[PDB]
Symmetry: D2
Subunit: 299 residues, 4 copies
């Protein structure tokens, strides 16, 4: 079974989407008394109409996550923040006691920072501590390009690196549409426009609807689950703890990686030019900051 | 395309599930500026990760719903903890009326499905205000009652709810009643597998199901309705001629008329084709008659303005 | 992983359907050299076009099925003494490399085949499932709906007995939208649908030249999905009876709860005598099929 | 409604996969009496077990294809091939032209580059609506062999191809990637030359082992084609299309990337080819040029 820690917006979006697919039984766990139990019941009535025979339940007891293959961490607090470090630190001791051999993917922001804290507090191998960054930035870039060029996003190959935030930088030179290089379809202006929209997409929604993304991370978690369950050997960009890769270590960054039934198998090093290594270094430093703002205890 | 009027909690759950199935393009409309666009946007990014090629939009302009085959109404308000039954009815009735005028002007040929509660009363107001025929004004009630009934029977017998066939009728509320005589599990009549006290236990869980989750997570059901709309949409797009229980405006069926009730009906590409009349006993006929009185009582409790 | 023993026309129709839903890695095993390999290969290219990262192989080596939790026997040739020998053969390979798995036979006559496979494998009664019921019900539901102009989804058809000539439906327990099937139909009409159902498989043979293959296949998808999800679902299957319905040591088509570990329990439907009589004939039809097999095969 | 023309091996595989997806109603049309009916009956029974509500029919009367928005042609046999098939296409083309006047036709019959040519000529439909299936299967196979040599999902492989559906089929390394990493960087020239053999030899390999040419590759390809159209996705897939200027060629059919929508092909994409790439493309066009001329004028035009 797949456990979900959160029972909030992004947690329920994930639950809804995972019930639709029916990959496994799912468990909802949240601190607020009766909250997860109540949502599991409504979610169970939905599965009953859709005919999805998976078991769906909720609990306030963290020890119920005992025996989980994947533990999706979405329990952070949204936009309207690094107070999410404490909840990561508090959740870090629970899965360390009841899910020591599970893969954990963090949907809390700042994810690169949060992934750093979860990794250190769980004492889990880097391959089983996954931060959800790339898949979303990539799709968003696909979406803006497509809207502008008038083509499906299924035909856009968008490469991105850095971290999940202000300093996230897409790599056009390696992106294309239906085979055609991106830089050959759009002028430098048009490319810098799609990159603003992509970088500022998350803030924009918040600005519009009133609260930060939840369907995006949710739909990205579905892919991640499906990728682990099939032992697929897929390459997706995630926020992972670096140990030499891209020249850095003792830090977290958004990079391409092959995920499997046992987690991250290896980090891929894209061939970058001086500029792109400049821009990747800016990102590493950006994450540098957020971690330094954290109190030593959480480090 | 499929238009969702709401941009709320049930409306957004419906949009999420509809995006999954990719049955068609879907357009979100709500009064609050930026709300529907903000959401449709998050959702579009989600379809981009899943590879679901459809269009998703959000608008504040009700004129953008023209050309819609199906209009899903979820705009109401939901019951809130420590809340007044009538303090919902009149509120949502006003919403329906207001929305009816929009549907009436921009989507004349569309099929409308309401989720707003009290569904029966809401379906009534919407039917009268739009000028649309019965066959195209659908209130969602029975599918969810049937699934919840099936779910509870399931938990109790240790079998898949997929193997349970539960028949329900009446209206969507206190007077909703099941027909155990016509129900079964894997081919076994329900009255054989369960005692009469056990059956009324599951009927309680079902009739009170909505209130239990509102008290637990703090707000009324939304996934159930949503999943219910997914089926309805698939049934129309496929012109399947499935039989599902819906709250419909009666014109003779079951010997009633000029009222709304939860009855079984054939659903197709152009709406309702015909209402099925289940063979009923003296007892069961009494229970249906009582269900009709509950809706009559709800309708009368509205202002002549909203009911005519 | 799901192992398919056959590479024939149902087995190939099953692999395609099973590949589309992505449930698990599938494995094709067949005696003919090259055939399974070359089909897995085509099937894998189709999988790449659709985006299903499952793993698809082909093989002539039966030891490759070690570690399969489910074996789908689609080997038979669609006769009796032949498919009996094939069952006899394959039974030794399953017994040696897949003692832990749930085998589901599709080979016809399913009832008789399910008996040979049970006796020869030595497996427990709950893990030797014969495919038959799901299919009868779907056909009956199909014929009823073509006549009433409603979706077959909305039809609840109950069938019992055996997968053949004495397969009988129980209208008394069947329904459409909650309405008993007898308030909708007449004798005469309910007898046409039954006649249709009972002859459906032979009609498709006359019309296209080979015996049904998509029906069994689609039914295997459901069975696999039922097992993987441990759904506790109730489907009619050809199982070895140990007392249920007042018979023991014979295979018949009856309702059963299916889960992650095979058949959990057979459901005994409250039947009327005429129904009991119908059921008895069915049993007796299978005892005839079984007593034709040479002692060695049974 | 979707109409399939054929009821064979690739016909039926398509029908099974389209049924699983449940995109729309199906119609099977084949010359042999009873074949499509019985096949549609077995398929319909399967649809009932899965609960897929669509309608599925069989028929020997081409009049029945009236109203389809998609017509799939799989009727081919698998120079003693070319002439037989071509005749087939011309016979089927007069039917489609009269009974599916508003239709998008997709050809799975081989050779396609030659068969699309005929169908185009004999139907008299605009270029938008006469699509030949070929690239989607070439790329997916090239993707497949790459994954198999790298040990990564083919979903993470972006293989580009051009030319035609046969020996002259040809991929483009410097535009193809894997996880965002350039194909040229991960594999040597030797290496890329090894996936290409495996590619161009696949069809022949599967016939040898399995005794009969590919069926699924095409069927699954037709599903993507059907989905792309039904959703008006504006997707980019390599198809065999009748050229009228693009790429500097005309009055010939070649495998090229195009945007496919609800009304057919919107536009053809013109890749930035080098001089060697261009030469290879010319060899492909030239292969088709002679493939068509091997046809009786009656059939070609």
């Amino acid at each position: 079974m797949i456990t979900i820690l959160g029972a909030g917006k992004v947690g329920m979006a994930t639950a809804v989407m995972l019930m639709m697919r029916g990959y496994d039984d799912l468990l909802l766990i949240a601190r607020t008394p009766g909250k997860p139990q109540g949502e599991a019941l409504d979610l169970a009535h939905a599965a009953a109409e859709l005919g999805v025979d998976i078991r769906i339940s909720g609990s306030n007891s963290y020890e119920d996550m005992r025996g989980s293959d994947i533990v999706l961490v979405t329990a952070g607090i949204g936009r309207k923040l690094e107070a999410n470090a404490n909840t990561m630190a508090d959740l870090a001791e629970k899965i360390k006691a009841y899910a020591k051999d599970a893969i954990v993917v963090i949907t809390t922001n700042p994810v690169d920072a949060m992934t750093y804290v979860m990794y250190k507090k769980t004492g889990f191998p880097r391959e089983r501590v996954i931060g959800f960054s790339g898949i979303l930035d990539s799709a968003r870039m696909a979406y803006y390009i497509s809207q502008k060029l008038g083509v499906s996003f299924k035909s856009v190959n968008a490469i991105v690196l850095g971290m999940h935030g202000q300093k996230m930088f897409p790599v056009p030179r390696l992106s294309s549409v239906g085979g055609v290089p991106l830089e050959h379809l759009m002028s430098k202006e048009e490319i810098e426009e799609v990159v603003s929209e992509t970088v500022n997409a998350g803030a924009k929604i918040t600005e519009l609807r009133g609260y930060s993304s939840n369907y995006g991370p949710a739909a990205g978690l579905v892919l991640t689950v499906e990728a682990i369950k099939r032992d697929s050997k897929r390459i997706y960009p995630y926020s992972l703890y670096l140990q030499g890769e891209y020249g850095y270590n003792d830090i977290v960054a958004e990079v391409p990686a092959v995920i499997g039934k046992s987690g991250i198998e290896r980090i891929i090093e894209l061939p970058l030019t001086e500029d792109e290594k400049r821009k990747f270094d800016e990102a590493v430093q950006a994450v540098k900051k957020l971690v330094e703002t954290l109190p030593p205890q959480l480090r």
